[PDB]
Design a protein around this ligand. Structure first.
Ligand SMILES: Nc1ncnc2c1ncn2[C@@H]1O[C@H](COP(=O)(O)OP(=O)(O)NP(=O)(O)O)[C@@H](O)[C@H]1O
Ligand SMILES: Nc1ncnc2c1ncn2[C@@H]1O[C@H](COP(=O)(O)OP(=O)(O)NP(=O)(O)O)[C@@H](O)[C@H]1O
Ligand code: NA
Ligand code: NA
Ligand code: NA
Ligand code: NA
Lengths: 363, 363
């Protein structure tokens, strides 16, 4: 069986690392210098606007998936008509647009930040009059890791926010700034028949808009049950197949956003679960029964901008190293480290690895 | 850092799977259709007799290793003079020749099967007169998985054995047939400074000359200590860097043979140890500190000749699947399965997977 992946970044790289021992063959749509290249059968560079060419490429394979939900949902529809794409175009369409994503939650009685679609300065003023400050003016369709938005803290920030973002193609959304206690995510995988394998909750820490640490299992039986029920609603309404990620605020579970894919907050599962989020995404789309997800306490630390020297990491002999072999650039995800946490030696190694990261990080 | 591997088979494939997340780049010497191709940066097909060409290829990389010790030890010397090869030419030279291997053990007071170098029919007759029957006439330099030899059970089998094998290039050895209770192997990894990371003993079952099952940890504190001391002698005398495998008969530890490489009897460590034999071979040759080897009860089952359907394997959701994506051929190693053994559900899945294997196996 051949699996085509749109994208050749680190998520594609790890899908192939996880899925290759199952005997599956991986092919990417992306560039020669992208980090999945060395671990997949082929990489083919086709502009995603050239729809018939992309569809022609896809038809070489038995099933298609993707690593970035910001892709054209029409392109996915076009492909899916010829060869199965997982997960669904509906999941992509709703998750990639902040207004559609939040409206979906509201339509099913699921809590989110208060939000308003913004089509004018007057509408934004009204949204601020109604739901208060601080708030964020975000684009509906652009943006990664806190970028492409404007935090509104005062009445003067309003016109400034509008003036910066007003011309964003495909529009804008006001979100009330949620004052959360902490953040958690629910990652799960739905197989071809809609059976869901759940991971425990992970507690995630963001720094400057980017995830820097993820801890699992986060043990709270009540929140976990609420999280799982929301996941089930999503899987059913999207007819979802694959790994799905839902990020929450806790303060009451409040949905932050969803990602129809393997997600950074699940990277711990490579070394902390019997079957990782990556192996299970692959098994899901391949029409296979999912792997057991029994998990053990693990911490995941992100390497942003830079990464400690491998020789320094290797000296901490229980740390599991996940370098993506990417180019260091301020703010860029270049790798992560996982560590199982059982005893005091693990705590000691964790301190040493955090120190190493503090010296290599560039956000 | 770039690592060159001579060979593109499943051992090379798994070295790259283990070592790629460390941020290392892998290149093989072998063919396009070989099973490591899809997980390494490049594969280059050069006949190993063309020494200057092989050396020219090797010089593109920072360190060289190999998956098959039957390679020309002179070729390794030639390469090593220009770029570091691990492990050593001495380890290759002794392990690849049954007479040299057994003579080494005898020279250091380490037990083996009684053995005699055979250069004539009369010498074989004398070896049988001295050390008895049953015995095996083996080549010194050829043979895999019980092939290329002749078991001598009677006095008529003697001339038959001689007539079959007498012209083997590089000679023959008589070995007394050891009547063992069971077999175990000691796998360990020595870093660049000679520090050794030990795995627990594994209990191995052979069927028709091929390994079919490996169980670890095999708990016997006395045998383990003897095994580790023998490993230390080998690492020191060979100035060994890398993963090393020693196979024993138990009946008293008696050395059977050694392999200067990752070995089938250590495949369990992919899913049963904090750091696998593959990741540690890579860390050793890369000049890195070795990973922790804390282990949990695991069984490894070999898929020979054929492999059960992936959909049938996936249904047993705790089994870890390791398909090499190779072509089924009677007697050929095409994959393995690992299973952690904790509770009764694991025992149940193990029975089901053994049944699946019995129906797919072709030895
Ligand atoms: N309304 C809000 N109130 C408070 N914090 C928020 C709000 N919206 C977003 N954030 C935080 O900002 C982070 C970045 O969101 P976003 O700009 O969508 O980045 P992203 O690409 O989705 N990265 P990630 O959330 O880690 O997958 C979120 O994970 C939250 O921690
Ligand atoms: N003298 C002996 N007496 C009894 N059994 C033996 C003897 N020599 C070899 N064997 C058995 O035959 C097997 C095959 O040995 P060999 O022909 O060298 O295959 P191999 O390629 O080294 N495969 P492996 O030992 O699994 O790495 C050994 O693993 C032993 O179980
Ligand atoms: Na490739
Ligand atoms: Na989203
Ligand atoms: Na390749
Ligand atoms: Na040997």
């Amino acid at each position: 069986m051949k699996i085509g992946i749109i994208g050749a970044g680190q998520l594609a790289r790890m899908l192939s690392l996880a899925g290759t021992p199952l005997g599956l063959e991986f092919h990417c749509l992306g560039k020669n210098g992208d980090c999945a290249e060395e671990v997949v059968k082929t990489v083919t560079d086709i502009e995603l606007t050239k729809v018939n060419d992309v569809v022609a490429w896809a038809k070489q394979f038995d099933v298609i998936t993707f690593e970035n939900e910001n892709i054209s949902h029409e392109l996915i529809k076009a492909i899916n008509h010829e060869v199965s794409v997982y997960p669904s175009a509906k999941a992509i369409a709703i998750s990639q647009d902040r207004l559609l994503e939040k409206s979906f939650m509201q339509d099913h009685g699921i809590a989110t930040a208060k939000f308003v679609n913004i089509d004018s300065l007057a509408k934004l003023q009204s949204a601020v009059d109604d739901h208060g400050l601080p708030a964020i003016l975000k684009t509906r369709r652009f943006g990664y890791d806190g970028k492409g938005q404007f935090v509104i803290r005062s009445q003067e920030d309003i016109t400034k926010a509008w003036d910066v973002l007003k011309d964003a193609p495909d529009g804008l959304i006001y979100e009330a700034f949620v004052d959360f206690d902490y953040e958690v995510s629910q990652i799960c995988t739905a197989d071809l028949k809609g059976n869901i394998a759940f991971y425990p909750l992970a507690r995630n820490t963001h720094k400057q808009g980017i995830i820097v640490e993820s801890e699992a299992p986060f043990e709270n039986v009540v929140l976990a049950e609420k999280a799982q029920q929301i996941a089930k609603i999503l899987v059913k309404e999207f007819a979802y197949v694959g790994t799905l990620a839902i990020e929450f605020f806790v303060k009451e579970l409040i949905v932050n956003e969803i990602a129809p894919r393997v997600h950074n907050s699940g990277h711990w599962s490579i070394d902390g679960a019997v079957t990782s989020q990556f192996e299970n995404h692959v098994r899901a789309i391949a029409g296979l029964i999912l792997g057991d997800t029994t998990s053990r306490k693990t911490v995941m630390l992100n390497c942003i901008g830079g990464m400690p020297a491998t020789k320094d990491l290797a000296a901490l002999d229980r740390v599991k190293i996940h370098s993506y072999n990417k180019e260091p650039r301020k703010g860029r995800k270049v790798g992560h480290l996982n560590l199982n946490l059982n005893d005091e030696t693990d705590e000691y190694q964790l301190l040493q690895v955090k120190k190493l990261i503090a010296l290599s990080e560039e956000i």
